[PDB]
Design a protein around this ligand. Structure first.
Ligand SMILES: *[C@@H]1O[C@H](CO)[C@@H](O)[C@H](O)[C@H]1NC(C)=O
Ligand SMILES: *[C@@H]1O[C@H](CO)[C@@H](O)[C@H](O)[C@H]1NC(C)=O
Ligand SMILES: *[C@@H]1O[C@H](CO)[C@@H](O)[C@H](O)[C@H]1NC(C)=O
Ligand SMILES: *[C@@H]1O[C@H](CO)[C@@H](O)[C@H](O)[C@H]1NC(C)=O
Ligand SMILES: *[C@@H]1O[C@H](CO)[C@@H](O)[C@H](O)[C@H]1NC(C)=O
Ligand SMILES: *[C@@H]1O[C@H](CO)[C@@H](O)[C@H](O)[C@H]1NC(C)=O
Ligand SMILES: *[C@@H]1O[C@H](CO)[C@@H](O)[C@H](O)[C@H]1NC(C)=O
Ligand SMILES: *[C@@H]1O[C@H](CO)[C@@H](O)[C@H](O)[C@H]1NC(C)=O
Ligand SMILES: *[C@@H]1O[C@H](CO)[C@@H](O)[C@H](O)[C@H]1NC(C)=O
Ligand SMILES: *[C@@H]1O[C@H](CO)[C@@H](O)[C@H](O)[C@H]1NC(C)=O
Ligand SMILES: *[C@@H]1O[C@H](CO)[C@@H](O)[C@H](O)[C@H]1NC(C)=O
Ligand SMILES: *[C@@H]1O[C@H](CO)[C@@H](O)[C@H](O)[C@H]1NC(C)=O
Lengths: 87, 425, 50, 197
């Protein structure tokens, strides 16, 4: 994206906090200093796939999430005379 | 005069029914734009470059530059969020096991190839090689292109993780933890999700694997044969390219002034009357940039709608099995595979399609001992002399027993009741 | 104006003195004293994000 | 958390503040006060100075109206999405994945909010998984038995039938499986005895 002055490029990849660009993100980590690093897409997982093995869940959890959705805005009416021809 | 298709007249009878006797899995392709080209314009350099007097004269024309910069930053943030709302739907990167024997299905054309440097599938290579001095002239005038947050390699890794989760687990890695399961059992569950039983999947596993491999192999050449196949992604690139080209060419207009170069006006004309010649150019270029911004707003809104549609399809077609007709493919949706593409996503929908139908004689119910017998799960068909019960998507004739039908009332109110003897084990 | 001057490989004609672009801005010029085609490229600029 | 509702209010406030600040600009004229121009200039030529401000303010108001239309477009899109979710997540039980909450959708509760709606999705998430040995089918008397509704699992020595979302081991009986063909085509079928009540 460009030249970044003020952050030290570390090699350990963490979660993206302040998106800079091109996969590089900034963060404020430990004294204290601003570091830049390549963002990590998540933890690596290896499903033990097999032609005869299956995974059956033995318990469950009821989870209440929260999803916000806008509906409307503030109805605004403009008057030409008062806005343009002020007194 | 354009034709509306072929002309078929299916025979409708009150006793005839059509039952399919075979089937085919078809891998259809669907292209969906996700992101756009983030563009940032330099107000001063575009309106009047290399000019110190215009740099001071522009300050008296209101703060339109701040508005345009805020609009472009909002568009860039929206385009960056569109790439995460579609591909970054899982928080656990999965890995394909070394043994790639999934029952007989070959996913080599969609799994990443570690031979090439870029971790892209053979299909993604064709998708990236078909979506294509002019980017330096616009740079020298204020128009710059900002790089996306998630690079192509990260989107490829996200698609590979989603593919590994769909293959190894199925739809369990989208709801909760990734539950391991053999792929033939996953296909049996997909068949049960559309009505077909597990015996059709388990007795024709080799044929289904061969048909899937053939369809995957044909998709690779079908995407390369048609040139305008990847047009739904090249159109946005062409639109942004021409929108930048016309924005650059609008600087070649005088807008009623005597010239288009400010150094040609400041040198000959004195500041007293040079204002009436510079303000016209300033107003014209500001209006052109404002029109460009207000058009890119609508373009980014359309791209956001397309990205929301693509995210909903990724959540419903890949992370599960959607029964919505003509949403995850034309026909009985079985599964879907996502692939990355320049500013877009390609969904390969594997869909169940019946074929080789056959006509039989049907009846609403049968009566054995004065009581009606309605099919519990299936339909009663006839071969001309005998009566059997078979499912509604595959001809599997079975003897009519007390387990395949249920008794409900007497057989004198049903219009179409036929006499037949049921079996009792 | 303002810009960087660099020797260009543009093969001008004996009568051609200037050079335009898509936006009719002068990209190359000819030094009247010594015949040599230059290349007027704008000064280094960019964006500053904090 | 309530960032999807505060952004709309912030955008409206910024648009109103910009429309107000567009009155303190000259638009190429000498000042932004109408009476000052009318008292410092003559009526014949004051028109060429006041028309610039008139056109600038009219263009600013037109740009504000166009931006409000563009914003109302996505606001209507979000309102239609919220209505579809209220009809599918609250008025019933939708099987769409990642539409009424992350997981197996159970129910949803609506709540009002300033210019918005908040959906609390009560969802079902499996946990505490365990690994078992599965088989496509079994045959006892030379005829394959496929699970009617469930899956065959094994605990190392015995075979049971469990559902696809909870570990409930049940003895393999006749009314839990259906017979279709013999065990010569299914790849991976294991021999096991079935029960008959
Ligand atoms: C980080 O990785 C680069 C490339 O391998 C290497 O040159 C550099 O020394 C590494 N720095 C650290 C912090 O180890
Ligand atoms: C079953 O999977 C294992 C790896 O877990 C593999 O070694 C073996 O060859 C596979 N068996 C079949 C049926 O090919
Ligand atoms: C299921 O989970 C709950 C909460 O963790 C726990 O109290 C309960 O004992 C668990 N039951 C089983 C089957 O382990
Ligand atoms: C079903 O179709 C496949 C492919 O056309 C064919 O090989 C197979 O023989 C067909 N089976 C039946 C039921 O005819
Ligand atoms: C998968 O397909 C490719 C191309 O047809 C082939 O080279 C490869 O051997 C196949 N792999 C398997 C699993 O047979
Ligand atoms: C069923 O009968 C109709 C009318 O004769 C015919 O068009 C259709 O092809 C038949 N279907 C089959 C293949 O049995
Ligand atoms: C109908 O099915 C029965 C049992 O399979 C068979 O014996 C008979 O020949 C069939 N008749 C016709 C007309 O297909
Ligand atoms: C069915 O059988 C009964 C006698 O068992 C007879 O009265 C009736 O007419 C028959 N109906 C048909 C459909 O032939
Ligand atoms: C310009 O004039 C000076 C002095 O006579 C001379 O040294 C120089 O070479 C001339 N340049 C040209 C080539 O016109
Ligand atoms: C199943 O096996 C996998 C891989 O060894 C392991 O990660 C998982 O915890 C196991 N599940 C249980 C508790 O049986
Ligand atoms: C499997 O389950 C049966 C019946 O509960 C039990 O008798 C047997 O010991 C179990 N085997 C193992 C190893 O869990
Ligand atoms: C299943 O049973 C048959 C006959 O008893 C025998 O031939 C075959 O080897 C058995 N197979 C397995 C999976 O043990």
């Amino acid at each position: 994206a460009g030249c970044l002055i003020g952050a030290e490029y570390v090699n350990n990849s963490y979660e993206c906090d302040i998106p800079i660009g091109a996969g590089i993100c900034a963060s404020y980590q430990t004294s204290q200093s601003i570091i830049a690093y390549t963002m990590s897409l998540g933890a690596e997982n290896s499903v033990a796939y097999s032609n005869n093995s299956i995974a059956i869940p033995t318990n469950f959890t009821i989870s209440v999430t929260t999803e916000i959705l806008p509906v409307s805005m503030t109805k605004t009416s403009v008057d030409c005379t008062m806005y343009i021809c002020g007194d | 005069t354009m034709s509306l298709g072929a002309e078929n007249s299916v025979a409708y009878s009150n006793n005839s029914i059509a039952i399919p006797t075979n089937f085919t899995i078809s891998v259809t392709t669907e292209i969906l734009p996700v992101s756009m080209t983030k563009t940032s314009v330099d107000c001063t350099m575009y309106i009047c470059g290399d000019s110190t007097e215009c740099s001071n004269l522009l300050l008296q024309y209101g703060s339109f530059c701040t508005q345009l910069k805020r609009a472009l930053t909002g568009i860039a943030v929206e385009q960056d969020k569109n790439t995460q709302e579609v591909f970054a739907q899982v928080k656990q990167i999965y890995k394909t096991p070394p043994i790639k024997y999934f029952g007989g299905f070959n996913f080599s054309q969609i799994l990443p190839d570690p031979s090439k440097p870029s971790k892209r599938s053979p299909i993604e290579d064709l998708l990236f090689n078909k979506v294509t001095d002019l980017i330096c002239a616009q740079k020298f005038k204020g128009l710059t292109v900002l790089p996306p947050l998630l690079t192509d390699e990260m989107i490829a890794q996200y698609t590979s993780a989603l593919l590994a989760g769909t293959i190894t687990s199925g739809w369990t890695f989208g709801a909760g933890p990734a539950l391991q399961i053999p792929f033939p059992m996953q296909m049996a569950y997909r068949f049960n999700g559309i009505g077909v039983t597990q015996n059709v999947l388990y007795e024709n596993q080799k044929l289904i694997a061969n048909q899937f491999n053939s369809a995957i192999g044909k998709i690779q050449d079908s995407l390369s044969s048609t040139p305008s196949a990847l047009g739904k992604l090249q159109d946005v690139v062409n639109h942004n390219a021409q929108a930048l080209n016309t924005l650059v060419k609008q600087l070649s207009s005088k807008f009623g002034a005597i010239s288009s170069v400010l150094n040609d006006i400041f040198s000959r004309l004195d500041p007293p009357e040079a204002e009436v010649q510079i303000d016209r150019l300033i107003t014209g270029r500001l209006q052109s940039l404002q029109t460009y911004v207000t058009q890119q707003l609508i373009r980014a809104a359309e791209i956001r709608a397309s990205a929301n549609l693509a995210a909903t399809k990724m959540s419903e077609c890949v992370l599960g099995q959607s029964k919505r007709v003509d949403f995850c493919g034309k026909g009985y949706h079985l599964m879907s595979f996502p692939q990355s593409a320049p500013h877009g996503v390609v969904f390969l929908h594997v869909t169940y399609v019946p074929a080789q139908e056959k006509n039989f004689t049907t009846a609403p119910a049968i009566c054995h001992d004065g009581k009606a017998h309605f099919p519990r799960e299936g339909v009663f068909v006839s071969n001309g002399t005998h009566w059997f019960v078979t499912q509604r998507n595959f001809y599997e004739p079975q003897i009519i027993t007390t387990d395949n039908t249920f008794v409900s009332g007497n057989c004198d109110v049903v219009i179409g009741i036929v006499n037949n003897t049921v079996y009792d084990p | 104006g303002t810009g960087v001057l660099t020797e260009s490989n543009k093969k001008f004609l004996p009568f051609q003195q200037f050079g335009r672009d898509i936006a009719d801005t002068t990209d190359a010029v000819r030094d009247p004293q010594t015949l040599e085609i230059l290349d007027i490229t704008p000064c280094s600029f960019g964006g500053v994000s904090v």
